[PDB]
Structures are given as structure tokens and as C-alpha cells.
Amino acid sequence: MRYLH
Amino acid sequence: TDPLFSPLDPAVLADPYPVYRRLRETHPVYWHAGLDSWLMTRHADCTAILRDPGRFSTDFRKIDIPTPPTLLSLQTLDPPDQTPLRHLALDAVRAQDLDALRKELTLFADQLLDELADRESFDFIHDYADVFTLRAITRFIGVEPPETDEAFARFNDDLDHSMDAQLDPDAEEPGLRARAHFNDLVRSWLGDPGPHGVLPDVVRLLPGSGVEADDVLVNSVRAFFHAGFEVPSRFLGNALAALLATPGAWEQLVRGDVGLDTAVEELIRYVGPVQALARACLQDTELGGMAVKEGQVVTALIGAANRDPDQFPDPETLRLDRKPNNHLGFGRGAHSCLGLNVARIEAHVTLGALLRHPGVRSAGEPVVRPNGTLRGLSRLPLTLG
Ligand code: HEM
């Protein structure tokens, strides 16, 4: 879970 | 399978908040073997991670993790390496005219919802939210929208899925591929900019910012655009769904017993889309009575922390008049959201326009997207009124 766009 | 938290489990994806609550009650700082990370479920500890870059880094290269192509960017560096890009973007963003944006959006929402009122029923996610937020983000940045064929939704799905790659290793390469595709779109934009908007300002503001015009700035612009598109659509679908599923809540907004000001904030706290923000521990630290070692990853579960009863009385209830409401929906610190003002205009404009159709009601079962990091729906069947 890495909030990366 | 994890004894306490399986974020891609369908039963958890249907409703993660009871799992969050139980996890926070039993192991507020919990070692998750599968995600290979500590999970923080408490508002005080998430804020502490988010505020301390020297001790919790987004640059996972600092714990010997190579950053894949397309991913070294504004989001994946810390000060001072990040501060030039952060300042270039902050300047480019503050140079914009938000009233012009708000007004053009209000015309657009009102027209879109009179169109959808003509139908028997429609899907709020694909027929309103996605159309609306894509208009919002391309107008704000100053570019011509991409074409929304099935290949676009396919790259979007891969990129979203790629955020959960630690739990599904086959998701990584399609996310890089998808992010490269949108970099090819960003390069086009930067290589022939239009006259106004955030992206023209970046090109104009480069000389002497300290930022080179390379793939790092390109990856940064892609992430600005993709977050600007998807995250508000995730929010709009969660918000309207919660209002209709919560008895009395829409009636409260329709009657005007509460303002959009406290209501929109409470909607962000309750069902904000961002669920996790990960960081790399650069120095041994104690959190929640647990020794977090240098080299380990920690994850702020801000969706869980926004329902922390230590911070919010009656945290599991949608109280549209909540005050104060110190939610973490938009993050904190060096990496806090650059679009929060655009986010809130979209939410006030969308909600203001729906309140023109007081008889709005569900027309089917919502469907939850199979994502854990960034939570939203893939359909919300509705009929207007
Ligand atoms: C309701 C909608 C939105 C929510 C809930 C939201 C939430 C967040 C959160 C929690 C972060 C922190 C990430 C971290 O700490 O690593 C963030 C960062 C960011 N947001 Fe938003 N966001 C929204 C909409 C937008 C929009 C509309 C834009 C652009 C127009 C945008 C651009 C960004 C960027 C570029 C960052 C990265 C900042 C950095 O790494 O320094 N977001 N957002």
C-alpha cells in the first residue's frame, strides 16, 4: 500500500 | 492470511471500517507481515508520522529500496530534495483563478444534472463524477483532456491496482506501464502548452526555480494530474453514497438544518478516499509501545485514524454539523495535498447542484472498487428528482 499516482 | 486485516478481502472491501475499529482497539500499532509494514490506526500517531520527514521518509531509497522508473517524483523525495518541486508546484497552483474555476464548474454541474434528470436512471460514478472531475482537472491544469475510451479506463485500473502491489506482486509492471502511458500524455502537454493554467505556469516558472525539466518533473506532473482526476471522483461517489445510506442526512441538507461547510468536511472525515500513506523509518523510534526499527516501513491508515474515538466523539456516526473536525483527509506536512482547494470547490459545487434535485434516490446497489489504498465506488445507481 503506497499512495502513489 | 492476516489474523486482523486483509485489505483486499471482499468482505473487508465491502466495509473496512469495522475492521479498522477492531484493529485500532486491539493493536493500534500493529505489525502486518503481509504488507511488511507497521499499521497505525490512531489519529495522534498518523499525524506524528506525517509531520516528521527526517524520521519517516517517502524516499524509500533511504532504506535501500530502488525507486522504479516513472516513480521518482515530488511524492517520493523529502526536503530538501523535494522543496524545489514543492515550491514550483505551490507557486504554479497559487497563480490560478479559483473563482473562474468554481463558476465554470457550477454551470457544468447544473447542465450535467439536468441532462441526467432526463433519464430513468444513471450511474453517478461514470456518468457524473468522472465526467465532472475530468473537466475540473484539465481546466485547472490548462490542457486538452485525453480521450476516455476503454484503453483509458484500462490504464486507470492498472494504475490504481498498482498501489496495492505489495499484496499482489503481478500488479507492479502494469502500473509502471500505465504510468509511462500517462507520462507520454504529460510530455505532449508540456511540449505544446496552451496559454493558461497550472501546466503553462510550470513551464513559464521553471527558469531559476531550481527544477530541471526532466522525467522527475514529468512524473510529478503526471501524479498531479492523475490525483487531480481520480481522488475527487472517489470522494464524490463515497460522499453521495453515505448521504443516501444515512437516514435523515440528505433531508438535513435539503431542509438546510446544516451548511455545506461543516457537511463537506464531515463527509471527508467519514468516507475520505485515501486509506493509507506509507513511509520509511530512518531512525529507531517507539510508537504505541512498539519499537519501530530503522529500515522498516510504517503506514498511516488515515481512513482509520479519521474514525479514532480518541480524536472524534461518536466517530462511527455521520454528524454533518461536526465541530471541530481535525481530520487527516488531506494529509499533513511536506507532502500535504496541493489540490485541497480544488477538491473542496468540486464538493461544494456538486452538492449544491444535487440539492436542486431534492428527490434524488438510489436506483440499485453500489459497487465498491477492489482497491485498498484509494477507496471508491465503480457504480452508484441513482435517479434524480
Ligand atoms: C477529495 C479529494 C482529494 C483528497 C482526499 C486528497 C488527499 C490527499 C492526501 C491525503 C495527500 C497526502 C499524500 C502523502 O502524504 O503522501 C495528498 C497529496 C497530494 N495531492 Fe491531493 N487529494 C485530493 C485531491 C487532489 C487534487 C484535486 C489535486 C490536484 C489538482 C491533488 C494533488 C495532490 C498532490 C500533487 C499531492 C502530492 C503532494 C506532495 O507529494 O508533496 N489532490 N492528497
Give a yes or no: residue B208 inside a domain: yes
Q: Helix axis angle, B215-245 relative to B83-94, nearest 10°?
A: 60
Q: Taking an 8 Å Cβ-Cβ cutoff, which residues of chain A contact chain B?
A: 1-5
Asked whether the beta carbons of B54 and B336 are under 8 A apart, the reply is: no
The verdict on B220 touching A (C-beta cutoff 8 Å) is no
| Distance from Cα B329 to the centre of ligand 1, integer Å | 9
Which candidate, B155, B344, B152, B357, places its Cα nearest to that of B267?
A: B344
Give a yes or no: residue B5 inside a domain: no
Alpha carbons B300 and B275: distance in angstroms, whole number: 8
Give a yes or no: residue B1 inside a domain: no
10 Å CB burial of residue B147 (0-12, 13-18, 19+) is exposed
Calculated CA dihedral for residues B11, B175, B295, B7, nearest 10 degrees = 0
Experimental method: X-ray
Give a yes or no: residue B2 inside a domain: no
**Strand, coil or helix: what is B279?**
strand
Say how many CA atoms lie within 13 Å of B318 toward its Cβ: 23
**Strand, coil or helix: what is B364?**
coil
C-alpha cell read off for B338: 496541493
Give a yes or no: residue B373 inside a domain: yes
Name B274's bridge partners: B374
DSSP state of B374: B
Cβ separation A2–B166 shorter than 8 A? yes
Alpha carbons B135 and B296: distance in angstroms, whole number: 40
Placement of cell 473542496 in the chain:
B344
| Distance from Cα B206 to the centre of ligand 1, integer Å | 22
**Strand, coil or helix: what is B32?**
strand
Give a yes or no: residue B174 inside a domain: yes
Give a yes or no: residue B64 inside a domain: yes
For residue A5, which residues of chain B lie inside 8 Å, CB to CB? 75, 159, 179, 222-223, 226-227, 230
Q: Could you tell me the resolution of this structure in angstroms? A: 2.0
Say how many CA atoms lie within 13 Å of B232 toward its Cβ: 30
**CA of B189: how far to CAs of B78, B125, B148, B325, in Å?**
26, 27, 17, 38
Segment (H or E) for B90: helix B83-94
Q: Burial letters for B288-301: b for 16+ Cβ neighbours within 10 Å, e otherwise?
A: eebebeeebbbbbb
Query: What DSSP assignment string belongs to B310-335?
Result: TTSSSTTS--TT-SS----TT--GGG
Cβ separation A1–B227 shorter than 8 A? no
Segment (H or E) for B361: strand B361-362
Asked whether the beta carbons of B236 and B379 are under 8 A apart, the reply is: no
Give a yes or no: residue B15 inside a domain: yes
User: Residue B181 is part of a domain; what is its CATH number?
Assistant: 1.10.630.10
Number of domains in chain B: 1
What is the domain range of residue B194? 10-383
For residue B80, is the peptide bond before it cis, meaning its omega torsion is within 30 degrees of 0? Answer: yes
Nearest CA to ligand 1 atom 6: B330
Asked whether the beta carbons of B328 and B50 are under 8 A apart, the reply is: yes
C-alpha cell read off for B363: 436506483
The residue whose CB lies within 8 Å of the most ligand 1 atoms, and thus the one to mutate among B199, B218, B231, B269, is: B231
